[PDB]
A paper describes a structure:
The ribonuclease in these processes is the RNA exosome complex, which degrades transcripts in a 3′–5′ direction and in a processive manner. The helicase can extract mRNA from the ribosome and is expected to transfer it to the exoribonuclease core through a bridging factor, HBS1L3 (also known as SKI7), but the mechanisms of this molecular handover remain unclear. We show that rather than a sequential handover, a direct physical coupling mechanism takes place, which culminates in the formation of a cytoplasmic exosome–ribosome supercomplex. Exosome and ribosome thus work together as a single structural and functional unit in co-translational mRNA decay, coordinating their activities in a transient supercomplex.
For structural characterization, we incubated the 80S-bound CrPV-IRES RNA with ATP and with EXO10-SKI containing an active SKI2 and an inactive DIS3L (D486N mutant), with the rationale of extracting the RNA substrate from the 80S but preventing degradation when the substrate 3′ end would reach the exosome exoribonuclease site. Signal subtraction of the 80S combined with focused three-dimensional (3D) classification, subsequent refinement and post-processing resulted in a reconstruction with nominal resolution ranging from 3.3 Å at the core to 8.7 Å in the outer regions. Human EXO9 has the typical barrel-like structure, with a lower ring of six RNase PH-like proteins (RRP41, RRP42, RRP43, RRP45, RRP46 and MTR3) and an upper ring of three S1–KH (‘cap’) proteins (RRP4, RRP40 and CSL4)10,11. A notable difference from nuclear EXO9-containing complexes is that a long segment of the RRP45CTD (residues 281–351) becomes structured as it wraps around roughly half of the EXO9 outer circumference. The DIS3L subunit contains an endonuclease-like PIN domain and an RNase II-like exoribonuclease domain that interact with the lower ring of EXO9. Second, DIS3L contains a C-terminal domain that binds to EXO9 by inserting between the RNase PH domain and the RRP45CTD. The outer surface of EXO10 presented additional densities, which we could attribute to three separate patches of SKI7EXO. In the first patch, SKI7 binds with a short helix (amino acids 555–572) in a cleft at the RRP43–MTR3 interface, consistent with mutagenesis data, and is further encased by the RRP45CTD. The third binding patch is located at the EXO9 upper ring, where SKI7 (residues 602–616) binds at the cap protein CSL4. From here, SKI7 residues 617–632 protrude into solvent with a highly conserved α-helix that extends towards the SKI2 catalytic core, engaging it in direct interactions at the RecA1 domain.
Author numbering:
A (entry chain G): 3 to 72, 90 to 270
B (entry chain E): 555 to 572, 579 to 593, 600 to 632
C (entry chain N): 9 to 273
D (entry chain K): 1 to 353
E (entry chain J): 5 to 188
F (entry chain A): 381 to 434
G (entry chain F): 5 to 290
H (entry chain I): 1 to 212, 217 to 293
Write the structure that this text describes.
Amino acid sequence: GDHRRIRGPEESQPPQLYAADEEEAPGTRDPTRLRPVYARAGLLSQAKGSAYLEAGGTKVLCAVSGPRQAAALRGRLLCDFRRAPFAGRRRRAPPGGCEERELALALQEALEPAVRLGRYPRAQLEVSALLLEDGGSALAAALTAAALALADAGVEMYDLVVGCGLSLAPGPAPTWLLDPTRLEEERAAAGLTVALMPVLNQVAGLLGSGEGGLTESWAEAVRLGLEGCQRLYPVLQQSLVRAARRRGAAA
Amino acid sequence: ALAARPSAFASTLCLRYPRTLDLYKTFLYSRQVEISPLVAITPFDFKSASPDDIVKANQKKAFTRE
Amino acid sequence: EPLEYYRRFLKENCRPDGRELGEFRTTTVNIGSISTADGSALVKLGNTTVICGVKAEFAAPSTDAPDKGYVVPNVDLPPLCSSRFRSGPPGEEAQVASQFIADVIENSQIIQKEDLCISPGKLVWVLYCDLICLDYDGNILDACTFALLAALKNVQLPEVTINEETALAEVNLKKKSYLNIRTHPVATSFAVFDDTLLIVDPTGEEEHLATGTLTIVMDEEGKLCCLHKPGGSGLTGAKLQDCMSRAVTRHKEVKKLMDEVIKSM
Amino acid sequence: MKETPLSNCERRFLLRAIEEKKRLDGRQTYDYRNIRISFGTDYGCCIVELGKTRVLGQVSCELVSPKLNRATEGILFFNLELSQMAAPAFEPGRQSDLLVKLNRLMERCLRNSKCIDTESLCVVAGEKVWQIRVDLHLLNHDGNIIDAASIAAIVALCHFRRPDVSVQGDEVTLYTPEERDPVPLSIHHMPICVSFAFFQQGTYLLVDPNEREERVMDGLLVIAMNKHREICTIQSSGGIMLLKDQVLRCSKIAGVKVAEITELILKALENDQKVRKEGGKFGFAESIANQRITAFKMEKAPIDTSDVEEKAEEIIAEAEPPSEVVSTPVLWTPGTAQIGEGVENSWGDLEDS
Amino acid sequence: VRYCIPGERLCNLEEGSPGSGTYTRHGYIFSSLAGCLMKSSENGALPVVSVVRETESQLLPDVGAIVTCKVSSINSRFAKVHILYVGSMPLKNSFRGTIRKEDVRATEKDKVEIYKSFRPGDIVLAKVISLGDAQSNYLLTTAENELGVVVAHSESGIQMVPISWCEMQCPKTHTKEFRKVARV
Amino acid sequence: GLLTGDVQLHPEASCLIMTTEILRSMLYSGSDVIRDLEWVIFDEVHYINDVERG
Amino acid sequence: TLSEAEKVYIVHGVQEDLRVDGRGCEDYRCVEVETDVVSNTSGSARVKLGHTDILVGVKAEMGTPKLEKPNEGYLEFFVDCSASATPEFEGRGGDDLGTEIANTLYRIFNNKSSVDLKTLCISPREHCWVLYVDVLLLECGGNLFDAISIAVKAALFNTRIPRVRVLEDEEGSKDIELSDDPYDCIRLSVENVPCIVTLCKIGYRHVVDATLQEEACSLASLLVSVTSKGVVTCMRKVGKGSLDPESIFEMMETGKRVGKVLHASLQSVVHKEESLGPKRQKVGFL
Amino acid sequence: MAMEMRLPVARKPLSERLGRDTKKHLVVPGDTITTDTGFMRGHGTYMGEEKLIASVAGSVERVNKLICVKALKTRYIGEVGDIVVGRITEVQQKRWKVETNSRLDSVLLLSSMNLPGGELRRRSAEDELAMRGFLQEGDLISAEVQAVFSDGAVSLHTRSLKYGKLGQGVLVQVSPSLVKRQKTHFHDLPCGASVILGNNGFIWIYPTPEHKGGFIANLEPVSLADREVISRLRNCIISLVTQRMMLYDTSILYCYEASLPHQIKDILKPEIMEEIVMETRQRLLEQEG
Amino acid sequence: LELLSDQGYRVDGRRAGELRKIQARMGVFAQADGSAYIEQGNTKALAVVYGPHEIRGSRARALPDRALVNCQYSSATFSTGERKRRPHGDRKSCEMGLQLRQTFEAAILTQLHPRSQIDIYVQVLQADGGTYAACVNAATLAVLDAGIPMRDFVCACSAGFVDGTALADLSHVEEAAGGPQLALALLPASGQIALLEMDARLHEDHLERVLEAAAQAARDVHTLLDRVVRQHVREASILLG
């Protein structure tokens, strides 16, 4: 198979497809709540900038490398999304996946409207994000963490990027929910993730697909996503303050 | 919008790694292991000609070209 | 400047880390945090953080001996742990860091593949243990080994029973068994300076300036599994006998650590 | 790195020669550089030397399940390879427009001629059948890689000997050279490649050219044709523009040459079988010229293994025992424990808040 | 003292002026870094407010800047270098440069043989002049009395010493060699 | 520089001394030398009356 | 690329409801859609929106149902990017664009009510129909998303799916037996297949069907997926600049109206092409 | 708004709509051209064995010893004193690189450029730092070819007052064989706009410069009555260029007047071009004839 | 299965020395610098060329004496009965683009464009029979459409051998029968051969007749494509003036 890795069995069917325990029932909740979030910046020592974001069942680690050699008059912004194989219900092929490339492009087309590349001619910035565990909305964590890492790496930006996520209930009276989990995401019909700049009040990225076809529900999904991105800001406000207070006092 | 308290995995991931007598004995350094220079003037204090400056002031002052 | 500056601390007998040239960094581990994997463990060694995860699946036994369940290790070095690794196919350092772990798993005989078969010739367990380095500061092959051994002490598998007329597999997810572990191989790494100086627990800068490296892994009965010497200056029997005397204490330290963390449940 | 360039004096001299119908190494137009074969010890392994080129051939078989459809035959891999040591230019992934034409020539010749009998390589159908796998390597490049590669593949396939099995009822069994004697293969014919080079727009031709003569030529014509009088592939290539009498002349020439080469190959295989059957000594070792300055041989030697016990004993006895400062493990909360110099506080809390 | 995030309201255009690493919009002054709040009062009131981290891990070169370098190889008409320090501070990575045979001396003169000016392995102080092409990227210059090789190295691994404006001599074997000595 | 017909020396020098026909030769084409010209002086103007070269 | 003065002229023109071609802020250039162009496949289309050129093909083949649901089929997309479109598309280089389009099409069609899934299953847990949609980029002249989302609805409307009456009984001939009729097929009920609507933003005005020059002067854009009934399937924002909340709401209405007109006029044109059958011949590439 | 979606219509071959027979000599590659005692080969042909063999499709054109074949589709070939229009694609240390639909790139030397200031002050290496600042990547110029290099390359200069960096307007690229050779390629058409007929196939349309080199930016809004003229000329140029028409001052003026009766937005149909090109054809027939 | 009846008729109804019907076209695309379209029998080909331009990448890979011919080959995933999708790494595409580069490095009179590239692209929309000759003829037409000078009008055709007779313009049914197939690339004026290929076994006595029949079938393709070129040039000459 692969001549650069250790070869095992050619085929391997996971026991979930043989799992005789029937799918359980998620439950119910209040759709006006947010999972408590703990954020830490400046984690890695060998990285120019890093941040670790954890909320409920989500664990994502992002690191930012400094400018390197090689629209110039402007610098590029390379991105790379990759999730740990021991994440989710099943295993994943190490070489890659189309979903990862889709999330990488959804990251690149969302973090460029924030940094000002007109200050790094002929240079480039590289951002790497890793998902240790998938326990809910993922693209709402690869944006917050990769934006905290950039601000902590001493690059000049217009503002931060704060993300959120939503999902649609499958009942006869569907209602959008805030911060869904895997028990509330695999039983859903549609999902939406927004990227709002809290001060400039400008939407950076939008993505959504599903079974909701009336152009009056998506207005609410968008504006409650904006309210979520306006409610996640203070925690990220005190995280970079603590990061700089600790980093500066070490000199 | 309440921020929360960490848990084991995070509080171990964020670790800062920063004479008191003698231990681990065999691993000390003592147990495991003329110059007449006649040096020249030590620096060259540039007290002298520095040609670029020469040719510039030379031609500017001279200003004859004949 | 490079060589002379460090030897000032060497003659001082206190390297810039603040160590007595014969002591290890601070070591800490956690087990049982990632709930989407069969077993996982996080190892911190004063930087050089490594995390491992185990997933169990079903697979067909091999054609030669249809009573063995495969175990496949893999070590990955992402471009975020350090700044010298570039994206793409795995590099030389990760390939050697994976072949070393495969050799340790094979030679040490920590597990027996005959304990993983369900029905001979039809189905066997397969274990996927993946290690990802979160930060590269030095001494990679010591923490990778400790991460793998710590992870293998927590993986638990469910009781699977195969019918006769249906001939399918019914997993009993309530009664979950454990894994049988025979030995506890622990590794120790030495960095040799220009021709005579040997230090323990090196650092990336020291490995950048050193001229060799040696690694020795020991069992719980004073038996050597592998003697990894990629090459360099050259050593003698007396120096190796000096190294194993330190490795005995290191192995006793680590085995007491594992014997204590597991007891706390 | 790249290969040395070609001057403008050698080109003139080679073309003056070719005009004059005299070659560098003395051999006239319709000649080959003489050949020299050498056999390994385990079956299906040979080293052919055409002039100063070397190719290593090695056959090997294995038992697999035969895909879906074609339930009563076997598969036949091939893999040419160019070794970085063959010549300066060869680079593992920077000569990707010669490998293709070479693999193709080799595969079309060997697999479309239907000389190997892949009919009788089954055990059951729908179940395990033998999967052979030829392998060639180029060791030293001196021109005409494909004639040598073809002769090498021929000899390697005509010297192999399979394992062998017992099948009766619905039950298998696999023997070994002591339980049962290895078995030969079935080879219908002997397809042998020939190459021609054309010089200054088809006015002259030269059989079997070497590497300088290969850099002063317009294009190449290959004609692969098994014994008797039966052509099996042709592939014009290079920079050539051909007539119609010339293809026929070339076909005649290739006929003659393949006749002679098959003579040689048969004689060499016969001699090798005679040697293996008499009971004498064979192998790569007993092929090294002894009449030559660059060869040396040494029979066995007990060195003196009389002292190792004493030295090891004194070494173990003469060194410092493990010390006795034992460390303590600290318990924070079930799940995480620390060993080493430790940390002052139990854990951080409200450090900055 | 207070720190910053790369956006917040700081001052009006009348209550101060933007400084280094800041931007303004709609009559307000907005932060663009996470450093420290510094207000340079200077003289004349209306302080030029700016934010500086003051812990520079990396910094991009400019049109004019002093850099400490390290020669990699030399040619008859150029000399590739590696940027190592941006003025004083250490650099986490290494860029590339090129000194053409016009930037050695402060006259842009003829002659000026490159071979005996910048022997490889030395450390030099130079100034950039441009952002360069894709072949030569930074186009450094040493056309000054203060620029040139500062700390050389002997043939056999001995710290070297300046001896003149053009000549340096070994202390051990008393050997004479040619460099381009910069003023200390 | 001397741009005489039979002697050509330093055609890129700061000061060029040439016959008259050379000036018209470099004036028919661009030659990118007129851009950096500050003074052009004629030494024998009495050839306006010349019957074949005026 | 185009200079700064040209970009200034274009952005000024768009704000004045004038464009270099002469149309308005909402006009839409005509297309030359056609069907039944390729022989070996089971449905074809050819959409020409301008300098762009599209050619697709749908082939229905026998297959096995997936594990999650047994009474269903599935759809397979493969957006090839031929190298004849642009010299820079030589060999490798058209892979990222092709993957981006294929993933967008998957998100468009990843719903329970896209067309149907009961019709493509014949025997539960044992067999199902599979559809291979194969887009082939021939030329690129801007607005590539809509020129493909139209040729997909067009080609999907022209499928055959030859009927099979084979009995599944073990005693009977379980092996799939066709109807043996070379001209016996079944339609596909594609009435509510969605389509993409692109809205480039220049200045503070949004423009439908932007050209390459008008695309190079824009900073962002929005994609809306609307069926004939007027419902939204996918909504993805693509670009390099912010957009602002208001422009989402005022772009959604234009996406709705353009979608409704596009679907009604496409239903009319396909019915006009179908009203007369084997007459009128078929012309394409010659 | 109705979103017309028409259907393809079969093309009528042989150009039967007017009907003409050619009296020229037509050849295809491989054909043997006249093989008399002594002749000289042109561009488009080659020689074999005592034979003049055509190497490209076209018509033979001979001026009194010379057999050559003129192809009907080529790329631009440079000649001395030829007006061209190009775009900067690379900015080098001592030159720019300009793309002008040729077999290679064209070089604009720094020595030949009206630098800012437009008079005699100085020219030295201090300008070299800022030379790469104003003539940046992707700008438009309009220069004149200076000389022919030894590998088909062309060097172009900007040593005049009408040449230099261009401003606002629209660009239309066509094949470099529909432009008629003349002596004045600069025009000031009495419609409300101007035009530059680049000999390489680049047509540049810009408004008249009000009263009276890139020194002036003039990045201010252009009046509404000027855009409609530019759009009309853009569509008329596309219409004449499409079928056969060779472009020059009178054909564009004739077609512009013929396009007044109906709107600028509605002229994109296959038939409206025909009914305009034929009317211009007959106006040329009743004027020249 | 009968591949040649006693009466002499093939499976599809044509005799031994009879070709299929060809229907070509010049000037299909507008953005590119050349185009063509040919359907030889039931095989639909397509070719697009780009004129001499600046070398992409500019990695000092130029030739100071001539131009750089670069030919590709591709195939649609619906070109045959089964889907048979392939990645862009197959060695069939590489060998077809190498025989295409070999024949067009010999047909084109390339010593007139130093330090220049010529990019040739071929797309097969439906493959049934000889693909090589359909690609060669479509790219010969595209090169003529682009105005690139060349020595002659290269045309290609195949042949075969069944029951002691020589066939011409074999089809997929006849090709997939294990016979001595054979293809050329001929220059009609000189009779020279630009490429020769073969597979499967064949006696030495019958090579002259298969080769002669293939050359004659290529000369028969020449006239049919020549009338298309002459009608196109007379069309444009009438249009121009």
